[PDB]
């Protein structure tokens, strides 16, 4: 349905999937880390003058079973693939996450996906150069946006940009 | 509805019930055959669990 956009947060443990979701949902941020099992949210928003609902599934970066992960990925319409700019290993992990999304969505030509480099407020701790992350997004044919769940930088942008991709795909079918 | 309990024991009991439903949904969905109705029910159960866990705190 064009009235409901199903977004999945994907990425390694501790990158800020939940922090981005909760900043977008409720305008809150806390530094306390609680690893996620699986959480979900729904919000009414206005996208380009149109009243829509966004559903967000916030996945575990430390997930136990591949079958559980695959069930979540299969149900999504678009994906925020998140890494922390302060953790190179979280950036390299995004390749395998994307592979898993592609495999579960086997017969879809192009999957709505945005690459999100979170924790932009910790520039002094950056381990992932902007050029490296952007070049990877270009190789995947997707956009790269840097966010901070703490300062709100680009948080609304990533959710709304992905919704626009989901909309464009939905209007092509 | 499911968010109506006000005791820690009652909220925990509703969490245990929703997690049971969630596990049963995953068992059904792990066959890999598309089922948008069951996927929608799974997201709803997760929304309820998320709401319950916030009430629990
Ligand atoms: N400075 C800063 N800290 C952030 C940012 N986003 C998240 N954090 C912090 O990083 C930690 C991990 O955040 P969290 O959202 O729980 O990560 P997650 O990806 O959901 N982890 P998991 O997969 O285990 O659920 C928390 O301590 C959180 O406050 C950000 O943009 N800036
Ligand atoms: Mg989380």
Numbering used by the authors:
A (entry chain A): 11 to 183
B (entry chain D): 388 to 444
Give excerpts from the publication.
The tightest binding sequences, termed HLR (E427H/Q433L/K440R) and SMLR (E427S/L429M/Q433L/K440R), displayed affinities of 5 and 3 nM for RalA, respectively, a vast improvement on the wild-type RBD affinity of around 100 nM. We obtained high-quality crystals for both the RalB/RLIP76 RBD HLR and SMLR mutant complexes, which diffracted to 1.5 Å resolution. ITC revealed that the Q433L mutation was the key driver for improved affinity, resulting in a ∼20 to 30-fold improvement in affinity compared with the wild-type RBD. Crystal structures of the HLR and SMLR mutant RBDs in complex with RalB revealed that this leucine side chain is able to sustain a network of hydrophobic interactions involving Ral and RBD residues. The mutant RBD structures show that the side chain of Leu433 contributes to a hydrophobic network of interactions involving several Ral residues (Ala48, Leu67, Tyr82) and Trp430 of RLIP76. In the wild-type RBD complex, Gln433 points out to the solvent, leaving a space at the edge of the hydrophobic pocket where Trp430 is buried in an interaction known to be essential for the binding affinity. When the Gln is replaced by Leu, the side chain shifts toward the pocket and fills this space. Lys440 forms a hydrogen bond with RalB Asp49 in the wild-type complex and this interaction has been shown to be critical for binding to Ral, as alanine replacement reduced the affinity tenfold. Replacement with arginine in the HLR and SMLR mutants allows this hydrogen bond to be maintained while an additional hydrogen bond with the backbone carbonyl of RalB Ala48 is gained. The replacement of Glu427 with histidine or serine breaks a salt bridge formed with RalB without forming any new interactions and ITC data demonstrated that this substitution did not improve binding to Ral proteins.
Ral GTPases have been implicated as critical drivers of cell growth and metastasis in numerous Ras-driven cancers. Upon association with and activation by Ras·GTP, RalGDS activates the Ral (Ras-like) small GTPases, RalA, and RalB. The Ral GTPases share a panel of effectors including RLIP76 (also called RalBP1), members of the exocyst complex (Sec5 and Exo84), and the transcription factor ZONAB. Our solution structure of the RBD of RLIP76 in complex with RalB revealed that the interaction is mediated by a well-structured coiled-coil domain in which more than 80% of the interactions with Ral are mediated by the C-terminal α2 helix.
